[PDB]
């Protein structure tokens, strides 16, 4: 179908704008869509990983340096490898926490669209699950509600991805599967005090918002850094357990991600996505 | 004399408290003190790097899992290797962002003490410099000021080192090479001037650039190529990536060579007891309710 990705939402001087040439494309796509989005801190291997879902080396473009690379949000519409008659829609996001940009508001808008447009949301981090991440995920989650405001589940399913993973998956003595880890980290605290409650308040809203959760670890894809010629490498050349792990991740998405859905049940196709995108983007550029 | 570290500030159920048996010790030490602290997200190889300043293996203890390890603040006193008649004091901190704890105001207190007790403050992070980091650094910085109050061009604010761990990426920008320092000042570079959201930027980059006089940055390549990472207290330098050895050596050399003597305001040099009594002052100052 589509040979490479194109920018869906442009990001210039803190204005987010739909790119009309993508809407023109969405608007022609009649099949239902599974939508996968990914976000995380910047320089964190997101675009590389998205590309593995499209089963191509080279697509969403990479960038090698300390400078951020992906700006705005890029979509890529491809045939669904495992659900005949569906399109897979990949969303690649500008990474959070650019110091070049120094703009948390803007971060939050992008984060929010991702969650809003997606039927599987993919939060990417390096090494550990981390409270500053928890936090932000909560904040954006609440934000999402407030955006739906202007204008049997349809909230997206969730995946945490852990990169360059090093540490023993172990805790309080006993082994952990990546999923036991992720629920360890949303594990509510006994009962009440009021700081027993401070806690919980994020963990609750997160356990509620995302029906399905899943988690995957990933070893460094290469032992030195020949880490920068990565658009170019086969799979011999990579650490085999990274290839194992990727494969596992792709199979989960292909086999579990659901068809994107509006409220009241209707399945989202091209034009229904086009219309969301406008709706949500128009909502952001007006008055809270 | 001091053979291994010792908890200086206990952290139990969200109340921090000085450890008497460690003041008893400080109270006996009468040489001047260079103080180096380190903080950063948890599980980030802080305690390891810290041992390197003491030139030992084994010392501050490590932990190899996803759970956090170092709790409170550990101190460790030792000769200074370059500055005769001084003591080097090392301060290893509880890492930030523990999901088990889920408690930022506790984080912040601990951040804040490190900054307060130190003459060289070392901020440790994985991979990149990163706005949520700079943000937090700013927040604490302006928290520092507030704690100092609750206690009444030639200055006594700590010097600053950013440490970047498991560093992968090209040090390159806008087309032109970068040294680790050029990176750090790249990140604190002020925006051209005028307008509003121009000055919402800037506002943290200002306070940092004022607060910390000297600034330095160091990169650090993953110690080992597999993950025999997890025994590490017990590997000799042959067995490590020899560019990480290089880099540790270079960072040690800077600390030893450049970290100043810790100083009260009005100029007095800090020794054992004057630390004992800073620790107490700052710790009591946190146990009221601002
Ligand atoms: N250390 C590390 N680097 C990676 C990984 N995956 C990709 N990279 C490299 O990190 C750089 C930026 O990749 P990218 O996907 O653009 O990061 P993004 O900004 O999150 O999109 C590229 O040189 C990638 O080859 C990884 O899993 N670990
Ligand atoms: N990936 C990685 N691991 C490290 C590095 N340095 C130490 N480690 C390992 O990370 C684990 C935790 O070390 P530690 O210093 O206690 O982390 P801390 O929580 O920040 O104190 C140990 O297994 C260390 O051997 C590093 O530079 N990179
Ligand atoms: Mg990218
Ligand atoms: Mg530690």
Curated annotation (Swiss-Prot), chain B:
Changing residue 69 to A: Abolished GDP hydrolysis. Residues 1-290 are annotated as: GTPase domain (Globular). There is a cross-link at residues 189, 191-192 ((Microbial infection) Glycyl lysine isopeptide (Lys-Gly) (interchain with G-Cter in ubiquitin)). Residues 30-260 form the GB1/RHD3-type G domain. GTP binds at residues 40-47, 62-64, 92-96. It comes from the Eukaryota. Induction: By IFNG during macrophage activation, and by TNF and IL1B. Changing residue 166 to N: Strongly decreased nucleotide-binding. It is found in: Cytoplasmic vesicle membrane; Golgi apparatus membrane; Cell membrane; Cytoplasm, Cytosol. The modification Phosphoserine is found at residue 151. Isoprenylation is required for proper subcellular location. Phosphorylated at Ser-151 by PIM1 in absence of infection, inhibits GBP1: phosphorylation promotes interaction with 14-3-3 protein sigma (SFN), leading to GBP1 retention in the cytosol. Dephosphorylated in response to infection, liberating GBP1. Interferon (IFN)-inducible GTPase that plays important roles in innate immunity against a diverse range of bacterial, viral and protozoan pathogens. Hydrolyzes GTP to GMP in two consecutive cleavage reactions: GTP is first hydrolyzed to GDP and then to GMP in a processive manner. Following infection, recruited to the pathogen-containing vacuoles or vacuole-escaped bacteria and promotes both inflammasome assembly and autophagy. Acts as a positive regulator of inflammasome assembly by facilitating the detection of inflammasome ligands from pathogens. Belongs to the TRAFAC class dynamin-like GTPase superfamily. GB1/RHD3 GTPase family. GB1 subfamily. Homodimer; homodimerization occurs upon GTP-binding and is required for the second hydrolysis step from GDP to GMP. Undergoes conformational changes and oligomerization upon GTP-binding and hydrolysis. Heterodimer with other family members, including GBP2, GBP3, GBP4 and GBP5. Dimerization regulates subcellular location to membranous structures. Interacts with SQSTM1. Interacts (when phosphorylated) with 14-3-3 protein sigma (SFN); leading to GBP1 retention in the cytosol and inactivation. This is Guanylate-binding protein 1. The chain holds residues 6 to 308 of 592 of the full protein.
């Amino acid at each position: 179908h589509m040979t490479g990705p194109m920018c869906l939402i442009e990001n210039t001087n803190g204005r987010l704008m739909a790119n009309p040439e993508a809407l023109k494309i969405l608007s022609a796509i009649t099949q239902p869509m599974v939508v996968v989005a990914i976000v995380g801190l910047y320089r964190t291997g997101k675009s590389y990983l998205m590309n593995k879902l499209a089963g191509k080396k080279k697509g969403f473009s990479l960038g090698s340096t300390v400078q951020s690379h992906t700006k705005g949000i890029w979509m890529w519409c491809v045939p669904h490898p495992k659900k005949p008659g569906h399109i897979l829609v990949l969303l690649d996001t500008e990474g959070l926490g650019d110091v070049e940009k120094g703009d948390n508001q803007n971060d939050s808008w992008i984060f929010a669209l991702a969650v809003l447009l997606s039927s599987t949301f993919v939060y990417n981090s390096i090494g550990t699950i981390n409270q500053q991440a928890m936090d932000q995920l909560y904040y954006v989650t609440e934000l999402t509600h407030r955006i739906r405001s202007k204008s049997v589940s349809f909230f997206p399913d969730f995946v945490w991805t852990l990169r360059d993973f090093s540490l023993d998956l172990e805790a309080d003595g006993q082994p952990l599967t990546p999923d036991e880890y992720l629920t360890y980290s949303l594990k509510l605290k006994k009962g009440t005090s009021q700081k027993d409650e401070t806690f919980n308040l994020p963990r609750l809203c997160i356990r509620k918002f995302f029906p399905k959760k899943k988690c995957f670890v990933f070893d460094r894809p290469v032992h030195r850094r020949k880490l920068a010629q990565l658009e170019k490498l086969q799979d011999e050349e990579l650490d085999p357990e990274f290839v194992q792990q990727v494969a596992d991740f792709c199979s989960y998405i292909f086999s579990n991600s659901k068809t994107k859905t509006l409220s009241g049940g209707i399945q989202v196709n091209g034009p229904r996505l086009e219309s969301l995108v406008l709706t949500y983007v128009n909502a952001i550029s007006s008055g809270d």
